[PDB]
Structure formats: C-alpha cells, structure tokens
Paper text:
[name] (Essential neisserial [name]) also termed [name] or [name] for ‘double Era’, has been also shown to participate in the ribosome biogenesis. [name] is unique among GTPases because it bears two consecutive G domains, GD1 and GD2, followed by a C-terminal KH domain. Each G domain lacks the catalytic glutamine found in many GTPases (e.g. Ras) and therefore [name] belongs to a class of GTPases termed HAS-GTPases (Hydrophobic Amino acid Substituted for catalytic glutamine GTPases). Our results indicate that potassium strongly stimulates the activity of both domains and congruently that of the whole enzyme.
The first structure, EngA1, was obtained in the presence of ammonium sulfate and GDP and was refined to a resolution of 2.25 Å. The EngA1 structure contains one sulfate ion in GD1 and one GDP in GD2. The content of nucleotide-binding sites was also well defined in the electron density maps. Despite the different nature of the molecule bound to the two G domains, the overall structures obtained are very similar to that previously published, with r.m.s differences of 0.42 Å (379 Cα atoms) and 0.31 Å (378 Cα atoms) for EngA1 and EngA2, respectively. Crystal structure of [name] with an apo G1 and a GDP bound to G2 has a global conformation similar to that previously published for B. subilis [name] with GDP in its two G domains. The EngA1 and EngA2 structures also suggest that the GD2 binds either GDP or GMPPCP more efficiently than the GD1, corroborating observation made for the T. maritima [name] structure where a GDP molecule was found in G2 while no nucleotide was added during the purification and the crystallization of the enzyme. However the GD1 and GD2 affinity for GDP and GTP are similar in solution. Thus, this apparent inconsistency may come from different kinetics of binding or from the fact that the crystallization process may preferentially select [name] molecules that contain a nucleotide bound to GD2.
Numbering used by the authors: 3 to 29, 41 to 60, 67 to 121, 126 to 205, 212 to 435
Write the structure that this text describes.
C-alpha cells in the first residue's frame, strides 16, 4: 500500500538501486522485491534539464508517500543536487536522503541539503541498503488514512464538552470571507479562497444523536483528530477557567509536534475589568508552561466578538509550522547567540558549535553539530531556541533542536 519513489539528477545510480529493490510490475507501479522484509510499492518517474527533473519530482510529490532523494557521493553536493533539493522543499511528504557510491569527510555538505541524515549506499553489494529502507519504512505509520491535496490546511478544535466548539465552528463559517463546500466526518471550506479542512466535525455533532455517558471515548477521538491535523485549536471556557483535563489533550498536541493556538471562548460571560484579560493570560502560561509559543485569543462564539481573529491565527500558526529557514542566516543567528552568552563548561571542556542546519518541517527541527553533545544542557538548548524564535518568528509552533557529534 505505501508508495515509494526515487528522485534525483540523472547519473547518480537511481536505476541500479530501483532495479535491486523492485519486484514484479503490478498490471508504472512495481511491487517491492521478494527478499525485502518490508511491504510497499515503487513508482517509476522516468518517461529540457531543470524542467525535466522538475516533472519527475512533481510525479513523485503527487503519487508517492515517501521519497528517496539520491545524490552521488563521489561528486559531492553539486549545484544540480541543490536545485533538486529546492524543488523538493515544496512537499510536506517525507524525504530520505541517500548518498550513492560511498563519507564523514563532507557530512555538513550533505546535511546542507536540508533533509537530515544522509544514508550511504552502494549499488554493487547493497551495503547501507538495510539502514536506508529502515529510515523509509518508519514513515509508513504516519501515512494519512484520509488524503487531501497538499494545498489544503487541516485543523481541529478540541476541548471539554460544552466549551463551545460547535458554536465557534458555526460562528466562523458564517463570515463573509468563508465559502462552505457544495468523507462525511470533515468540513471543507475556503477562506479568502484558500482551502481548509476542519477535522472530524461529525464527532463534534455526535451529541444531539447520542447521550454522554463518559468523556473517555470523546477524548480518545480528539487525539485521533489531533494526529490528522497540522494546527490544533485548544478551546478553553472563560466562565469556569482552566481544569485538569484541559492539560491532558494540550500536552498531547505539544508532544505530537503540532502547531497550537489557544482560544478562550465565552469571553462575553466573564466578570471583567481592566486587568482580567492579562491575568487570564498569565494563568494560561502558568498552567500550560510547555505552550509558550502558542498565541492566546479571547473571543465569544455568542456575540461574535473577535471571531474574525481565529482564521488568521490558524493561517499564521500553519505557516510557521511549515517554515524552512536559510542555512547561512541560521548560522549567523547561532554564532550571534554564542557571542551574547558563552557556552557551558564541564571540568576543562567547553561546548563548541561548528555548524547548524534545519532537517525537517512540521514542526521545524534543527541539528547543531558540536564538540560533545553532553555539554549541551537543556537550559542552553532553550536559550538557543529563543534566539532562533527572536530572529525568525515561529509563533504558533514548537521547534526541535538536537546536538550531534562529528
Ligand atoms: N455566554 C456564551 N455562551 C456560549 C458561547 N459559546 C457557546 N456557548 C454556550 O455553551 C453551550 C455549549 O455550546 P456547544 O457549542 O454545544 O459546546 P461544545 O460541546 O463544545 O460543542 C451552549 O449552550 C452555548 O450556547 C459564548 O461565546 N458565550
């Protein structure tokens, strides 16, 4: 069922590798070879230079689930490889980098491509092939049950029963900027002509057909919706304030690496004066300390006050979630941070940072090449995170930093 494609500039050894791992043609599409301990299919993208590679990568982006991006290790990273990489930045689908005909000499060069760990291989006696296919197969679990066009922004609303999820959805769908369409679990619509899907609206409308006997199935259903979304809107009740179950689902969103917006509904019904909002914010920050990146919005599904602010926040959070940073700027940001604040020491050793690069999006993840990963303490990691945020934004999304040795 999962589909794999191999992509890269001509003459890097793609055909050799393809022929090795492919079995019989499903009659285009080939089944994986009998000896493999993985079950998947391959797609051929064969069939004028920059446009030729472009079309191959576009077939791959549209029809495959996981992409292998191949380069030639003996040539190193060429302008044409960098060109292919730039085309590939346009998908959210997983891309695994394979380095053919090889290793440690140019580690940064291959990491420069921005797809993370390079898997060395040889089409002769298949050395490295086990590690490469392992890396590819591990994405197989994250393949969507329900597939939408890449353009569509997928989000969900979560929160305890009666916080106003249904009311907010109905209020947001009634604005002049929205066009509702026309799976019966999701709701499709456009906002300023951009396509969006609200994940699992059926589960939000479950009541009205069914009595609530327990929350336990509703919560489990919410976690599935989170899994399918890029942006999660955590909705809190302004009247009754924060409660312990609010933490459970929001913590899950954070650990799942999702973009997050915090929404306070029923703001109309709150006993308010000049400082009630600011104190509510601080209370959210104190209860949800792992969500410092998430913006907080105050609105009323009832009076429609500030409803106009939700979609723009979902948009911004989604954008930041998907953002890919330029490497030279990234490195200047980190060198500037290290200048501001010297690195942690341990006996006589000092952390040294050689190079940093982004490795993935949704959420943005970075590797920093160091001295010794053990000298990179959690507090210093957070310091680096905040310097990256100051320079690039990243509001609405978590980010990941990993120290690695040469
Ligand atoms: N005062 C006030 N009440 C609201 C607001 N939004 C929803 N409610 C009420 O809260 C109750 C639960 O709303 P509902 O949308 O069914 O919550 P859900 O279970 O999260 O879908 C309903 O009686 C709504 O009228 C609001 O902004 N202000």
């Amino acid at each position: 069922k999962p589909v794999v494609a191999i992509v890269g500039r001509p003459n890097v050894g793609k055909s050799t590798i393809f022929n090795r791992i492919a079995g019989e043609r499903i009659s285009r599409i080939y089944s994986s070879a009998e000896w493999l301990n993985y079950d998947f299919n391959l797609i051929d993208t064969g069939g004028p230079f920059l446009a030729q590679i472009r079309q191959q990568a576009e077939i791959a982006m549209d029809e495959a689930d996981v992409i292998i991006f191949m380069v030639n290790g003996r040539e190193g990273v060429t302008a044409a490889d960098e060109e292919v990489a730039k085309i590939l930045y346009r998908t959210k689908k997983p891309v695994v980098l394979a380095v053919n005909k090889l290793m440690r000499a140019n580690i940064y060069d291959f990491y420069s491509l921005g797809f993370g760990e390079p898997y060395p291989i040889s089409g002769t006696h298949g050395l490295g092939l086990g590690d490469l296919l392992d890396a590819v197969a591990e994405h197989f679990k994250n393949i969507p049950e329900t597939k939408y066009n890449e353009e569509v922004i997928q989000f969900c609303l979560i929160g305890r029963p009666n916080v106003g999820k249904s009311s907010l959805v109905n209020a947001m769908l009634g604005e002049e900027r929205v066009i509702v369409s026309n799976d019966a679990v999701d709701t499709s619509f456009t906002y300023n002509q951009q396509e969006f899907v609200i994940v699992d609206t059926a589960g939000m409308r479950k009541k009205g057909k069914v009595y609530e006997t327990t929350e336990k199935y509703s919560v489990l259903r919410a976690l599935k919706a989170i899994d399918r979304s890029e942006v999660v809107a955590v909705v809190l009740d302004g009247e009754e304030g924060i409660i312990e179950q609010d933490k459970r689902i929001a913590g899950y969103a954070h650990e799942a690496g999702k973009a997050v917006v915090i929404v306070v509904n029923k703001w109309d019904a709150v006993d308010k004066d000049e400082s009630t909002m600011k104190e509510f914010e601080e209370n959210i920050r104190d209860h949800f300390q792992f969500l410092d990146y998430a913006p907080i919005l105050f609105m009323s599904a009832l009076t429609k006050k500030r409803i106009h602010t939700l979609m723009p926040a979902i948009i911004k959070a989604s954008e930041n979630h998907s953002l890919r940073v330029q490497t030279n700027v990234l490195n200047d940001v980190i060198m500037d941070a290290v200048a501001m604040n010297p690195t942690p020491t341990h006996n006589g050793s000092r952390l040294k940072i050689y190079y940093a690069t982004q490795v993935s999006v949704k959420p943005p993840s970075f590797v920093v090449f160091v001295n010794d990963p053990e000298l990179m303490h959690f507090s210093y990691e957070r310091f680096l995170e905040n310097r990256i945020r100051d320079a690039f934004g990243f509001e609405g999304t978590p980010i990941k930093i990993f120290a690695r040795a040469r």
